[PDB]
Design a binder for this molecule. Structure first.
Ligand SMILES: [Mg+2]
Ligand SMILES: [Mg+2]
Lengths: 195, 195
């Protein structure tokens, strides 16, 4: 029953987006990808040229019943998100309605901080952009989950597995996260949800 | 100047394919994606439903002068590769002309073994498919580079970074592989090609 709205824009980071989508599907989460292209185009060219088809334009699915909204990074993709009134309103509405906001890489500093969506809360993002996250909020962790504000953040292409697994934990739980992790041949430095 | 031909078929594993493409581009390698087993259609639905647009049909690019041919996994995609005469012949021709064959996940066992492409090569692949690789050829390692036959293999979605980085090391050098690795925020456990 859990569901995720994964946003995509021209210049989104394709490893971040695709890894996350794949993991969520493996976790039994229904995924809808939403284009935030300004014209509604669904055929998105990502930051390294990968061409990815979104399922729907954001305006058609933003009001949907999703448990989490996911913001991939990629500098130009994140700038598109920042500059989209609809995207920002949608993020705010997920937060205000008690749902989860998940953002990786460039997205925290580029989207969340300028719009002051989370004035209180811990967050991370891509490390070269750490001076764009307020110092009292920054943590240098692969994933940061601040349950007080239901904000999940993560750092870069290489933390996309950690990020996706944490979304699975938050939507479906530890058993499913561990199950998905066990499928991947993941590196020892990524938490695998069993103790 | 280095270039790569990344093959895509219905059911290819999208994290494996996309992570590899992204890393290669970050390494300064020109990447062409080719659809296989689709009668020329460029829209490829991957194993978890991610839809990619390939650059060209394989038949149109198979005789390009790429330095490496990359075979993503995903069991259905790898079966399409196995069952495509053009794919198999292209892989053989890359090898005979002194170029690299790179295969991940289901691709070694599904494509390389049944066609006896590398009959005494050493190789890895997805662990649950160990029984599909002749016992004397199997290594259980995140990445295997058999320099004698120019065969690069790797294990799963979670080894796609390791796989892509070794391609960069081989085609454009260790310093570039480290530069790319340093961009990613990689997990502990993955080799970063530093000094
Ligand atoms: Mg503040
Ligand atoms: Mg044999």
């Amino acid at each position: 029953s859990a569901s995720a709205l994964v946003c995509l824009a021209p210049g989104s980071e394709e490893t971040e987006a695709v890894t996350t989508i794949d993991l969520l599907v493996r976790g039994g989460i229904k995924v809808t990808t939403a284009s935030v292209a300004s014209d509604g185009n669904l055929a998105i060219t990502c930051s390294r040229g990968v061409k990815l088809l979104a399922d729907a334009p954001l305006v058609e699915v933003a009001d949907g019943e999703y448990d989490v909204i996911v913001l991939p990074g990629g500098i130009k993709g994140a700038e598109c998100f920042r500059d989209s009134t609809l995207l920002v309103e949608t993020v705010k509405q997920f937060h205000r309605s008690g749902r989860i906001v998940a953002a990786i890489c460039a997205a925290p500093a580029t989207v969340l901080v300028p719009h002051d969506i989370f004035p209180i809360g811990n967050m991370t993002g891509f490390p070269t952009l750490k001076d764009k996250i307020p110092a009292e909020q920054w943590l240098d962790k692969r994933v940061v989950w601040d349950a007080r504000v239901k904000l999940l953040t993560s750092q870069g292409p290489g933390t996309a597995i950690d990020f996706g697994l944490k979304i699975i934990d938050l939507l479906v739980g530890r058993e499913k996260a561990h199950e998905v992790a066990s499928q991947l041949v993941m590196a020892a430095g990524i938490y695998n949800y069993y103790e």
